Amino acid sequence: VSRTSIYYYAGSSRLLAVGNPYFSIKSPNNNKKVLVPKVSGLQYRVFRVRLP
Amino acid sequence: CPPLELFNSIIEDGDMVDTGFGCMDFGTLQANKSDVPIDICNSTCKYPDYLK
Numbered sequence: 001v002s003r004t005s006i007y008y009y010a011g012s013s014r015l016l017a018v019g020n021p022y023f024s025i026k027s028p029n030n031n032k033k034v035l036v037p038k039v040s041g042l043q044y045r046v047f048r049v050r051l052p
Numbered sequence: 053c054p055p056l057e058l059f060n061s062i063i064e065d066g067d068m069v070d071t072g073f074g075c076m077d078f079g080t081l082q083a084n085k086s087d088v089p090i091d092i093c094n095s096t097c098k099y100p101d102y103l104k
Binding site: 014016018036 | 103
């Protein structure tokens with residue numbers, strides 16, 4: 001692999017993430033209908049970023 | 053449960069920093085007026101937004 005002399009920037013502007021800190025709740029109607037998602041301060045935040 | 057929204061404004065003096073209880077407006081989002089000390093209960097606390 002040969003290094004060239006070109007560089008670039010990537011912009012990934014602010015993310016929204018709110019919900020219940022304890023568990024997740026779902027609908028009484030179905031069982032796959034999420035209502036507010038479980039998000040805590042202990043969750044494994046893993047990102048999957050594409051590249052052009 | 054009321055939905056949460058990200059507001060942003062200008063800091064003026066007399067207003068307080070966060071005290072570990074969430075950067076939010078305690079006056080309109082609480083009703084009991086009995087969850088925080090009396091210093092911040094009728095006001096809102098702010099915090100910087102360094103990346104913005």
